[PDB]
Design a protein around this ligand. Structure first.
Ligand SMILES: N=C(N)NCCC[C@@H]1NC(=O)[C@H](CCCCN)NC(=O)[C@@H](Cc2ccccc2)NC(=O)[C@@H](CC(=O)O)NC(=O)CNC1=O
Lengths: 731, 453
C-alpha cells in the first residue's frame, strides 16, 4: 500500500467530510468515483442549515469534489404554517453504500411531524439514487409512531447492499431502542415511491418484530454485515448489538430469506461495546465468509496486572458443520480504540487469501489515528500486521479520527490491486491509498566447487605468468508477478566473495577480472519463467592470509530499480514482503578436504644457569614436529625477554636444522619468526638450535622466561600448545 | 599518654574546648610547669589540678515543656497535644541526642460528595435519596469532624434524543403528556459545594425534584467524571479522603452511546462546568469510558461508591469489577446497608518531619521508630498509621565549629501536624576563667596567642 504520495480530499470546514466513504462504479461509464459523506455540511436547501451532504470525488482529473443533488427541496408542509419534516441539522451522509449504479445515502437524524399529532421524532430518511431517477426511502416513517414503535427508529444508521439487490438497513432506536433490521428489494423501493404519500408500504419486506421488555435499548442495527452463512446462496444479515446481554454486546445472524435467528455471539467484558463495527469476508480462501467484530473499549490485563483499554477484534472462521472458530486480536495502545472500523480489502497482494484493515483512530503519536493492515493466511489470520498507516494532520478543534471509516476491495487505478480510502472527518479529509504490485523474485546461487584445493593451481591469473586456483559461481534471477507491470525489470545485482571478517581485516577471494571480493552489475529480467543466469570466475589469494578456519562465504543481494519500474502514474512496484533479499552460501588433506595438523614443540637449554653481571650466551634446543596433516604457512614464534638478544641459528651442528629465522619487534613483543616449512608435511620432525645473548643485570628477577609456540594457518589445530622455558639466574 | 589535646599545640582554654569534646583545660596555677594544661580531665585529676580550675562543659538536653500526649482531639479539657519545648546546650564539634513523639490524635478529614439523579424514573425513590443524603452527614459527623459535604445532579444529555422537544411547551414541562409539572432537564449541575454545614446540605437536598427524559439509561457517568475532574468547583481537599457517592435506579449510558445523538467527540476529560454550575459540554462530548473514569479516579484518589436500588444491584455489581476499588450498596428505606460502606471506607484510612530555621552550623541525624520498636536511622517518615499509633524519632544535633551567635533556635515539625518542638540551642565555647603570660605585659593574650608589642 503506497504511503509516500496518496490522494487527499478536503471539504468545507466542520462538515465532518469523511465520516462515511465508499466507491462509486457507474456501469454506464468507465470512470470510477469516490463517495464521501459530510453529515454536517451547509446545503442550499431553502431554510435548511447543516442538512448534510454526500460528495462525488473524481480521483484522477484534478481531484475535484462535488456534492450530489439528492434533495434540493427544504422542509415540507403538513398544512399551511405547519412543517411536516425537519431537515435542518439532519445527518445526511452518516452512511454511504454503493453498488454499481445505485447510491444509497441516509440521514439517521431526520425529524418529521407525525401525521396524527404535531410532534418531533427522528425516524431517518434514505435517498436511493439510480442512473437518473432519484427516489426517497424511509421504512421507519410508518404508522407505528412514538418510541413504542418506529417513531425513534433512526433508520439509516447502518446500511448495506446484498448480492441480489436487497438493501439492508438498521434502526437502533426502534421499539424503545430495541433495534430493528429492515430489508427491501431495490426494484420495489423504486416502484413504490410516491412523493405525496408519507407511509409507503412494501410487500416483500422482511422485518424484526417486537420482543419482550427485557431486550430494550440493545441498539440493534448499529452496524450491518451481509454474507452467506447457511449455504443457500443468499446473503444473510449480520448486525451489531453493542448493548445486549447486560451491555456485554452481541452480534445477531439472521436468515437472508425469512429473517430467522441462526447464530448469536455473546461477549466477555461489559461496556467493551462488543459490536461497534462488523464485517463479513472469507479470509483464508475457503469460500466460507467469516465475521470480523470489533470492541474498541476492551480492557485487558496490562504488564502490571491492571486493566488497560486497547480495543479488541474477534475473528470467527466459518465451518461446514456450522460452528465458528474464534480468535481474538488485542490492541497495542491504550485509549486507541482498536476495532472501531473493520474494512475488507479482498486480495490486496493477490496472495490467494483475502486481506482486511483494522483501524485505531485514536492511537499512534499525538493520537492522530493509525491503521493496521493484516494479510490472509490459511486456518486463521496473520495476527502480526504487515503495514502501518498513520494520520498526518494534527487536531485543529476535533480529534482527527484518522481511520474512523475506511472502504476497500475496489481497484480505482485499474492495475489488478484493490485500493483503500480512509476518512479523516476530524480534520474533514479523505485519503486514497493505492496498492502496489507484489513481485516475488526467487534467487538461485550455486557454487560448484564446494570444497576446493589451493594445490589445484591450473588457473591463470590475467596479466601475470603466475598460476592460481579458481572456482565457478552461478547466480540466477527470475521475476513473477500479477497485475499491471512493465515487461522488463532493471534489477541491480550485487555480490560479495567473503562474509564475516569484521572491520575489513582481510579478504581471501578475488574475482578473475579486476580482482575484488565485490562486484556489481545491472541486469534486465523479463517477467515469467525465463530464469536468466550468469557465471563468474574467482580465485583465492598462497601465503597471503593466516585465516583458513572460517568457511569462505558467498553473498548475493538484489535491489530493484524502482524509479524506472513505475507506471505512467509513478506508482513504483514492490518486492515480496516475505522473500529474503539476501541469500548466503558457505564454501570450503584427507578425504574431508581439510588439512588437520597436530603441532607439538619441546624446548631444552644447554645452560641451566645464567650469571648476572655479564653477557651469558644461552643456546636453546627446540624440537618441533607435526603429527597431523599438512601445515601451510607453519612458523616458529619464540617470545624472548627484553634482555635476551637473538644472534642466529646454530649452523656448526649438522644435527640442528639451519632455519631461516627473522627477529621481529611488533607491538612491544620481541619475537623470532622461524620458517619451519610451508607445507609442513605429515610425520616430519625438526630439530634446531638457537643462540641468544642475555644482558641480565636486574637484581629482582630469579629466572628468564621464553615462550615458544608453533603457529600455522590451517583449519584445525593450527597452533601448538604454548611452552614456557625458564632458565634460572645464577650469582 | 599523649592525645589530641596534648599534641595540637593548645595554648588556651578556648582552643582546648574547640579542639575536641574530650579535651579539658586546667586553669590552676599550682599545676607543675611543663604538664599539659589541655588534656583529658582524668589526666588533669591525675595531674592533681584543682577540679574547680578544670573547665569541662558537658552538653545537656534539658526538657522545657513536656505536656502529656493527648488521647482524643474532641476533649474540651486542655489543648490537643500531638508532639513541646526543648533546650539544647552544645560545646563545639560535639553532638547530643534527644527523643520526640508524634501521635495521630485528630480525626481524619473526610470529603463526601453526593450525586443524585433527577429523572422521572425515581419519583418513587426521591424520598430514599433525600433520606440517604441526610443520614450520610448524620453518620459522618458522628465519626469524623473535618467533614465537607455537597452535591450535584444529573438527568441525561439535553439533546433531541433524550429531550422532549416535540411540543413547543413540553420543553419547560417534560411531564406535559401526562399533565403534570416537572423541572426542565439538564445534563449535570453542581448545586452545593463541599461545606461543613449540615443544615444547608439538608435543606438543599430536600428542595430537589425530578425531571423527565426519554430512554431508561441516564447519563450519570458524565456526572461522575465532571465531579472527579473538577477540583475548585467541587471543593476537594488535598488532605481529606475523597468519596463520591452515586445514585440511580436504571441502566447507565456508556461511551459511544452518544453517536445516536450526533455526538461523536470523545470525552476530553477536562473540567467544563462554567460559571453557572452547569455542565457546559453535555451536548458536544460523548460519555466517558470506564478506562478514563478509572484513570481519573486513581489520579485524584476518589473512592466512588454505588448506592443503587435492588433492580440494578447486579448490573452495577458487575460494573464495579471493571472499576477497581468501588463497592455497591442497596438503596432503600433502610440505608444502613449503604452506610456500612461509608463506615468501612473511613475505617480503611502519614508522619513526616520538616525542619524550620535550622542553624547552618548545626547538623541533624534522624532515627525513625515507626512500628514494633524498629529503628531505621537516616529516615524521617513513617507510613501506615491509624488512630492511637504513636511513633518516635531520635534526633542527634551536631555543631560545626562554634557559631558567633551564642543562642539560636529552630523548630522540628511533622508535615500538617501543627504541633512541634521548638529547640533552644546554646553554644558553650568560652571558658569561665577567660572572663602577664606574654612576658609580663609585652603583648596581648588573645585566642591563645601573644601578639607582642
Ligand atoms: N415496552 C416496554 N415497557 N419496554 C420496557 C421499557 C420501560 C420504560 N418504562 C416504563 O415502561 C414505565 C411504564 C409505567 C409502568 C411501571 N413500570 N415507565 C417508567 O418507568 C418511567 C416512570 C414511571 C415509573 C413507575 C411508574 C410510572 C412511571 N421511568 C422512565 O424512565 C420512563 C421515562 C424516562 O424518564 O426516561 N421510561 C423510559 O425511560 C424508557 N421507556 C419505558 O417504557
Amino acid at each position: 500500500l503506497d504511503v509516500d504520495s496518496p490522494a487527499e480530499y478536503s471539504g468545507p470546514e466542520g462538515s465532518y467530510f469523511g465520516f462515511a466513504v465508499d466507491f462509486f462504479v457507474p456501469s454506464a461509464s468507465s470512470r470510477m468515483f469516490l463517495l464521501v459523506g459530510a453529515p454536517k455540511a451547509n446545503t442550499t436547501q431553502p431554510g435548511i442549515v447543516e442538512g448534510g451532504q454526500v460528495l462525488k470525488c473524481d480521483w484522477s482529473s484534478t481531484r475535484r469534489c462535488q456534492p450530489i443533488e439528492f434533495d434540493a427541496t427544504g422542509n415540507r408542509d403538513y398544512a399551511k404554517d405547519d412543517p411536516l419534516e425537519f431537515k435542518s441539522h439532519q445527518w445526511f451522509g452518516a452512511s454511504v453504500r454503493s453498488k454499481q449504479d445505485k447510491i444509497l445515502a441516509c440521514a439517521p437524524l431526520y425529524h418529521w411531524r407525525t401525521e396524527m399529532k404535531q410532534e418531533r421524532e427522528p425516524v431517518g430518511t434514505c435517498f436511493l439514487q439510480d442512473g437518473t431517477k432519484t427516489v426517497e426511502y424511509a421504512p421507519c416513517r410508518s404508522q407505528d409512531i412514538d418510541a413504542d414503535g418506529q417513531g425513534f427508529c433512526q433508520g439509516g444508521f447502518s446500511i448495506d447492499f446484498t448480492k441480489a439487490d436487497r438493501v439492508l438497513l438498521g434502526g437502533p432506536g426502534s421499539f424503545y431502542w430495541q433495534g430493528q433490521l429492515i430489508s427491501d428489494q431495490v426494484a420495489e423501493i423504486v416502484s413504490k415511491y410516491d412523493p405525496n404519500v408519507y407511509s409507503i408500504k412494501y410487500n416483500n419486506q422482511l422485518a424484526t418484530r417486537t420482543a419482550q421488555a427485557i431486550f430494550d435499548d440493545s441498539y440493534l442495527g448499529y452496524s450491518v454485515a451481509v454474507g452467506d452463512f447457511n449455504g443457500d446462496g443468499i446473503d444473510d444479515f449480520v448486525s451489531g448489538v453493542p448493548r445486549a446481554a447486560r451491555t456485554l454486546g452481541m452480534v445477531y445472524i439472521y436468515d437472508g430469506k425469512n429473517m430467522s435467528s441462526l447464530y448469536n455471539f455473546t461477549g466477555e467484558q461489559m461496556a467493551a461495546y462488543f459490536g461497534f463495527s462488523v464485517a463479513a469476508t472469507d479470509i483464508n480462501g475457503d469460500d466460507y465468509a467469516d465475521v470480523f467484530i470489533g470492541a474498541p473499549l476492551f480492557m485487558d490485563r496490562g504488564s502490571d496486572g491492571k486493566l488497560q483499554e486497547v480495543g479488541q477484534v474477534s475473528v470467527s472462521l466459518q465451518r461446514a458443520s456450522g460452528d465458528f472458530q474464534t480468535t481474538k486480536l488485542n490492541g497495542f495502545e491504550v485509549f486507541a480504540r482498536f476495532g472501531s472500523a473493520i474494512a475488507p480489502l479482498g486480495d490486496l497482494d493477490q496472495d490467494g487469501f483475502n486481506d482486511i484493515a483494522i483501524a485505531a483512530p485514536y492511537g499512534g503519536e499525538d493520537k492522530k489515528g493509525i491503521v493496521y493492515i493484516f494479510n490472509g493466511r490459511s486456518t486463521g489470520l496473520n495476527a502480526v500486521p504487515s503495514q502501518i498507516l498513520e494520520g498526518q494532520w494534527a487536531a485543529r478543534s476535533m480529534p482527527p479520527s484518522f481511520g474512523y471509516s475506511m472502504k476497500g476491495a475496489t481497484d480505482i487505478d485499474k492495475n489488478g490491486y484493490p485500493d483503500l480510502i480512509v476518512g479523516a472527518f476530524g480534520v474533514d479529509r479523505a485519503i486514497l491509498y493505492r496498492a502496489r504490485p507484489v513481485i516475488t523474485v526467487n534467487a538461485g546461487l550455486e557454487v560448484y566447487p564446494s570444497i576446493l584445493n589451493q594445490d589445484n593451481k591450473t588457473c591463470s591469473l590475467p596479466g601475470t605468468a603466475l598460476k592460481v586456483s579458481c572456482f565457478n559461481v552461478r547466480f540466477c534471477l527470475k521475476a513473477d508477478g500479477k497485475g499491471v507491470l512493465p515487461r522488463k525489470l532493471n534489477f541491480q545485482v550485487e555480490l560479495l566473495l567473503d562474509k564475516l571478517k569484521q572491520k575489513g581485516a582481510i579478504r581471501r577471494a578475488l574475482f578473475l577480472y579486476s580482482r575484488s571480493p565485490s562486484h556489481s552489475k545491472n541486469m534486465t529480467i523479463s517477467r515469467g519463467g525465463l530464469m536468466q543466469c550468469e557465471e563468474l570466475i574467482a580465485y583465492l589469494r598462497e601465503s597471503e592470509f593466516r585465516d583458513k578456519l572460517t568457511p569462505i562465504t558467498i553473498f548475493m543481494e538484489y535491489r530493484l530499480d524502482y524509479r524506472t519500474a513505475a507506471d505512467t502514474t509513478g506508482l513504483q512496484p514492490i518486492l515480496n514482503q516475505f522473500t529474503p533479499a539476501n541469500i548466503s552460501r558457505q564454501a570450503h588433506c584427507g578425504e574431508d578436504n581439510v588439512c588437520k595438523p597436530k603441532l607439538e614443540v619441546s624446548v631444552d637449554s644447554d645452560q641451566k644457569k645464567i650469571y648476572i653481571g655479564d653477557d651469558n650466551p644461552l643456546t636453546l634446543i627446540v624440537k618441533a614436529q607435526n603429527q597431523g596433516e599438512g601445515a601451510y604457512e607453519a612458523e616458529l614464534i619464540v617470545s624472548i625477554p627484553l634482555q635476551a638478544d637473538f644472534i642466529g641459528v646454530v649452523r656448526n651442528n649438522e644435527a640442528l636444522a639451519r632455519l631461516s629465522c627473522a627477529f621481529k619487534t611488533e607491538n612491544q613483543t620481541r619475537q623470532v619468526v622461524c620458517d619451519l616449512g610451508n607445507p609442513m608435511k605429515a610425520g616430519t620432525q625438526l630439530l634446531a638450535g638457537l643462540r641468544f645473548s642475555v644482558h641480565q643485570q636486574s637484581e629482582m628477577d630469579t629466572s628468564v622466561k621464553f615462550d615458544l609456540q608453533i603457529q600455522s594457518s590451517n583449519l584445525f589445530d593450527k597452533v601448538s600448545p604454548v611452552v614456557s622455558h625458564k632458565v634460572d639466574l645464577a650469582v | 599518654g599523649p592525645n589530641i589535646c596534648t599534641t595540637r599545640g593548645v595554648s588556651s582554654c578556648q582552643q582546648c574546648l574547640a579542639v575536641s569534646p574530650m579535651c579539658a583545660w586546667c586553669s590552676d596555677e599550682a599545676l607543675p610547669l611543663g604538664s599539659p594544661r589541655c588534656d583529658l580531665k582524668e589526666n588533669l585529676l591525675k595531674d592533681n589540678c584543682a577540679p574547680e580550675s578544670i573547665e569541662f562543659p558537658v552538653s545537656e538536653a534539658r526538657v522545657l515543656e513536656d505536656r502529656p500526649l493527648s488521647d482524643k482531639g474532641s476533649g474540651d479539657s486542655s489543648q490537643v497535644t500531638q508532639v513541646q519545648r526543648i533546650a539544647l546546650r552544645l560545646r563545639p564539634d560535639d553532638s547530643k541526642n534527644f527523643s520526640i513523639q508524634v501521635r495521630q490524635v485528630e480525626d481524619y478529614p473526610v470529603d463526601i460528595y453526593y450525586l443524585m439523579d433527577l429523572s422521572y424514573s425515581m419519583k418513587d425513590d426521591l424520598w430514599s435519596i433525600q433520606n440517604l443524603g441526610t443520614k450520610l452527614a448524620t453518620q459522618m459527623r458522628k465519626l469524623t469532624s473535618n467533614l465537607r459535604i455537597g452535591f450535584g445532579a444529573f438527568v441525561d444529555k439535553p439533546v433531541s434524543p433524550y429531550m422532549y422537544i416535540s411540543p413547543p411547551e413540553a420543553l419547560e414541562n417534560p411531564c406535559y403528556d401526562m399533565k403534570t409539572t416537572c423541572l426542565p432537564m439538564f445534563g449535570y449541575k453542581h448545586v452545593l459545594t463541599l461545606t461543613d454545614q449540615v443544615t444547608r446540605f439538608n435543606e438543599e437536598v430536600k428542595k430537589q425534584s425530578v425531571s423527565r427524559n426519554r430512554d431508561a439509561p441516564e447519563g450519570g457517568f458524565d456526572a461522575i467524571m465532571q465531579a472527579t475532574v473538577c477540583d475548585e468547583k467541587i471543593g476537594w481537599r488535598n488532605d481529606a479522603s475523597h468519596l463520591l457517592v452515586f445514585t440511580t435506579d436504571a441502566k447507565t449510558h456508556i461511551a459511544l452511546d452518544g453517536r445516536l445523538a450526533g455526538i461523536v467527540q470523545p470525552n476530553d476529560g477536562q473540567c467544563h462546568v462554567g460559571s453557572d454550575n452547569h455542565y457546559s459540554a453535555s451536548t458536544t462530548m460523548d460519555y466517558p469510558s470506564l478506562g478514563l473514569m478509572t484513570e481519573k479516579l486513581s489520579q485524584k484518589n476518589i473512592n466512588l461508591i454505588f448506592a443503587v436500588t435492588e433492580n440494578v444491584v447486579n448490573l452495577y455489581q458487575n460494573y464495579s469489577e471493571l472499576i477497581p476499588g468501588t463497592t455497591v450498596g442497596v438503596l432503600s428505606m433502610d440505608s444502613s446497608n449503604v452506610l456500612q460502606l461509608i463506615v468501612d471506607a473511613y475505617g480503611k484510612i502519614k508522619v513526616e518531619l520538616e525542619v524550620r530555621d535550622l542553624p547552618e552550623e548545626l547538623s541533624l541525624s534522624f532515627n525513625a521508630t515507626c512500628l514494633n520498636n524498629e529503628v531505621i536511622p537516616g529516615l524521617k517518615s513513617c507510613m501506615g498509621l491509624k488512630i492511637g499509633d504513636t511513633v518516635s524519632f531520635s534526633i542527634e544535633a551536631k555543631v560545626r565549629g562554634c557559631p558567633q551567635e551564642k543562642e539560636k533556635s529552630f523548630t522540628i515539625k511533622p508535615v500538617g501536624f501543627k504541633d512541634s518542638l521548638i529547640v533552644q540551642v546554646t553554644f558553650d565555647c568560652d571558658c569561665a576563667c577567660q572572663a602577664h603570660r606574654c612576658n609580663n605585659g609585652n603583648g596581648t593574650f588573645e585566642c591563645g596567642v601573644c601578639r607582642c608589642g
